Design a protein around this ligand. Sequence first.
Ligand SMILES: O=S(=O)(O)CCN1CCN(CCS(=O)(=O)O)CC1
Ligand SMILES: O=S(=O)(O)CCN1CCN(CCS(=O)(=O)O)CC1
Ligand code: NA
Ligand code: NA
Length: 572
Amino acid sequence: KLRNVMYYGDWSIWGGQGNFYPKDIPADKLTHLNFAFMDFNSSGELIYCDKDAAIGHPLGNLGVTYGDVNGGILNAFQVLKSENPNLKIGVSLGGWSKSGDFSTIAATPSIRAKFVENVMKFIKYTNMDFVDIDWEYPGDYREPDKTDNINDEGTPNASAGDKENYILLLQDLKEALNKQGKELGKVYELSVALPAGVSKIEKGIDVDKLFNIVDFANIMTYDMAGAWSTTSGHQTALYTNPNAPEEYKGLSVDESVKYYISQGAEREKIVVGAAYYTRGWEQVSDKGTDPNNPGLFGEAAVVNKDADLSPTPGALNEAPMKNGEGGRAGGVWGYNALDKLKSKYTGLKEYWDDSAKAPYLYNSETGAFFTYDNIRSIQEKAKYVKENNLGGIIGWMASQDATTNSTKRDELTTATKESLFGKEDLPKYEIKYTENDITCTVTPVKQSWGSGGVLKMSITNNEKLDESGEVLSTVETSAKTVKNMKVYIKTDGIAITGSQYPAGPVTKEGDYYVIDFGKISDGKLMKAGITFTFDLNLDKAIEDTNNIISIEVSQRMYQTSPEFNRQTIWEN
Ligand SMILES: O=S(=O)(O)CCN1CCN(CCS(=O)(=O)O)CC1
Ligand SMILES: O=S(=O)(O)CCN1CCN(CCS(=O)(=O)O)CC1
Ligand code: NA
Ligand code: NA
């Protein structure tokens, strides 16, 4: 079974990525959606990159106020899955900028165990389905590049022990996932992000052992050429053009996959990467390296400067170059910004390298050169996956895809899905939720005056908050809040004519009376430990509860989103 995997960065929601909220992800076209990234410290405690993004932002949902506990990307992912049950949702830990604490965690069994325990709790409270470990990279000594990213940790504590310790970490995670999956009655998966190139693999990836632990592995077959080099090239090519110079030999999807297989990787677990952005160079001279691809593998003149004044051959980026926030000139433009790119760099012509099956843009008069993925190269990558019995495709990243006919950013995502799977719907999966500890009492009220009767009902959220630290306490608080509660009451011969605050309004829907706490501002987010006690009005006085059959409750993340976790709280 193939996979169509997508990264979604938590910073998608701000202006740099055009304020792209999860509801506009084409989730019916994905099998796996990675929340990128969760940080963590050297003691194994999880740490947010952007707390408001993760747990507080309203994300375009009309009834959500900033900071409301049903806000945030993590809750939005749950809604995407409810609305698109083909989808598995998961969490990417680390990434290029937050891999600095892996070496320490992986080296000490007690810290490894704490990290694993915290990740298991996280995915329990967020109802996530997989864990993706993006250790970039084990055994690779690297300092931060604060000009690129003030928050970059690098991997300054890398060591030769990382290769074996990563295997231990992955083994611990998979065993914990197996255990928790059995406890909760669900299937979990474990994935990793892997380097494309041989030297990084040799430094830190025990291929054969790793592939026997993970469910699948995402090969980062992008960023394989760029402004760190003074030779133009393809950054994410399917095949190695035979004219490639030594520095780019090996750095294609095909050669990377073939190397992994030669080292023991199981084909069906290999997911290959597609980049939804350009890289490029300001001023490339055609050296005639490949006469059939002008400008390719040409010499890039060192004519620009980074934000820290370092000379560079890189072209300008879509975003302004600022020290500490995209400070390196890399020719980096989102796929959805190719029209902006062409307005800034005029005179670009589109080329296709038939030997690499990769597009590029080149101005033969100015020398500007950009390398990227398009619909055609993604279709070629998909054909390669199918013909070689590989595992799927991963895209980096969602917010960079282009709109087609709606507000969804889905041009490349749709092309990927249809080339892998065709036009039919993706398989759907059952979604399980853990019932909340919700109890209730019902008490007939003696009313010697007036007409009708009264039933006094109390509903209690018996959950209690135990987790410590910002990450686990916030996801726990959300999970143990009863959200937009609907109460379904089935009676035999008893009519509920009305309801009173703190109850929401009551209606008859089929054989049930339904109380909608989504319509009570004080009742729509019922925190742990809270009780609502309220009067229900009846058409006739009642002396016992014998004609009350059942009371059930359901939740909704938003007033608009699907009901879930329907559970019985009182039965006769
Ligand atoms: O200012 S914004 O909030 O728009 C972007 C903040 N920040 C910039 C750096 N990237 C690094 C991603 S990675 O290097 O870890 O892939 C994460 C987002
Ligand atoms: O002894 S050596 O290590 O030199 C060769 C071992 N060799 C590596 C390649 N795989 C192909 C797996 S697959 O093609 O069936 O997926 C077979 C075994
Ligand atoms: Na960290
Ligand atoms: Na193997």
